[PDB]
């Protein structure tokens, strides 16, 4: 309860570039390891985070997120900090589209939107785009907005509240592109960005139940590491 003034800073980090990312395929609950270029960039991310002291580290249970978290912990000079994996931090479940070429998925989603080109989908809110993915999936295994947004926010709230109970501090959270876009939309849609890059950092401050989105898809940590 003495937690009210504590500040928690979430370094909400997209994992490094994988095989499926490189081959332009939907990778949600599907997973694949980092490619060497991805390893290089995640290594620079770690170096660029060496002066940020983390109290906790979390990732999804996706191999790509685990691998990236281990690289960041190693190169940020916190190799012994325990990594906590959480299944509720997974990327959106693309259902029938898992592993499909993104061009094929978007053609099928655009058809469900009844739009000429998947181009016009960019006009759509993230809410309606994620809804359209499940609409296009005949198996209805893909998550919709209400499923995804609910589980993402509950888990981020849990991590924030726990960190505040432990005195506040910095928390590394290695997760996924749509999850990040979705979380920003929920917290402060004035800052929402689709397509945050691999190894980018979205810094979110939490205090007394109030979130502040400080940065979105920041590549400065990689660049610091790279110098």
Question: Is residue 19 part of an annotated ligand binding site?
Answer: yes
Give long-range contacts, CB 8 A cutoff, 24+ apart: 104-112.
105/26, 105/133, 108/136, 109/133, 109/135, 109/136, 111/136, 112/136
- Is residue 16 a contact partner of residue 42, using CB atoms and an 8 Å limit? yes
User: What single DSSP character describes residue 212?
Assistant: E
Question: Is residue 64 part of an annotated ligand binding site?
Answer: yes
Question: Is residue 90 part of an annotated ligand binding site?
Answer: no
* Domain count within the chain: 1
Q: Report phi then psi at 153, rounded to 5.
A: -70, -40
Q: Report phi then psi at 121, rounded to 5.
A: -65, -30
Question: Is residue 195 part of an annotated ligand binding site?
Answer: no
Q: By C-alpha distance, which of 60, 66, 58 is closest to 148?
A: 60
CATH number at residue 42: 3.40.50.1240
Which sign, positive or negative, has the C-alpha torsion 113, 115, 119, 125?
negative
**5 vs 2, 53, 97, CA distance in Å?**
8, 20, 44
Q: Is 34 helix (H, G, I), strand (E, B) or coil?
A: strand
- Is residue 71 a contact partner of residue 43, using CB atoms and an 8 Å limit? yes
Question: Is residue 15 part of an annotated ligand binding site?
Answer: yes
The C-alpha atoms of residue 212 and residue 227 are separated, in whole angstroms, by 29
Catalytic residues: 15, 91
Record the resolution, in angstroms. Answer: 1.8
Which helix (DSSP H) or strand (DSSP E) does residue 105 occupy?
helix 102-113
Q: How many residues does the chain have?
A: 227
Query: Which residues make Cβ contacts (< 8 Å) with residue 166, sequence separation at least 6?
Result: 55, 56
Other CB atoms within 10 Å distance of the CB of residue 154: 11
The C-alpha atoms of residue 51 and residue 41 are separated, in whole angstroms, by 17
The domain containing residue 116 runs over which residues?
A: 1-227
The C-alpha atoms of residue 124 and residue 153 are separated, in whole angstroms, by 21
* Two structure tokens written together for 76: 């940020």
Q: How many CA atoms lie within 13 A of 163 on its CB side?
A: 28
Q: By C-alpha distance, which of 222, 203, 217, 199 is closest to 18?
A: 199
Other CB atoms within 10 Å distance of the CB of residue 220: 11
Say what angle helices 36-48 and 63-75 make with each other, to 10 degrees.
40
The beta strands (E) that lie in the chain are given as 7-14, 54-59, 83-85, 169-175, 201-207, 210-213
**165 vs 54, 57, 60, CA distance in Å?**
15, 16, 22
């Amino acid at each position: 309860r003495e937690t009210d003034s504590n500040v928690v800073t979430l370094y909400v980090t997209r994992h490094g570039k994988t095989i499926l990312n490189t081959n332009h395929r939907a990778q949600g609950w599907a997973d694949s390891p980092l490619v060497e270029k991805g390893v290089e960039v995640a290594t620079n991310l770690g170096t660029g985070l060496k002066d940020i002291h983390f109290m906790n580290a979390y990732s999804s249970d996706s191999g790509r997120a685990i691998e990236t978290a281990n690289l960041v912990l190693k190169y940020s000079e916190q190799s012994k900090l325990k990594l906590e994996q959480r299944k509720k931090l997974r990327e959106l479940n693309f259902g029938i589209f898992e592993g499909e070429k993104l061009d094929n998925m978007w053609d099928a989603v655009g058809k469900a939107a009844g739009v000429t080109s998947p181009e016009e989908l960019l006009k759509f809110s993230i809410q309606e785009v994620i809804d359209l993915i499940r609409a296009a999936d005949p198996t209805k295994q893909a998550e919709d907005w209400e499923l995804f947004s609910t589980r993402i926010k509950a888990e981020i709230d849990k991590i924030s509240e726990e960190a505040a109970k432990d005195g506040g501090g910095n928390v590394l959270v290695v997760v996924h592109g749509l999850l990040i876009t979705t979380l920003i939309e929920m917290l402060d849609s004035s800052k929402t960005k689709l397509g945050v890059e691999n190894a980018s950092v979205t810094k979110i401050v939490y205090q007394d139940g109030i979130y502040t989105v400080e940065s979105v898809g920041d590549m400065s940590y990689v660049a610091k590491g790279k110098e």
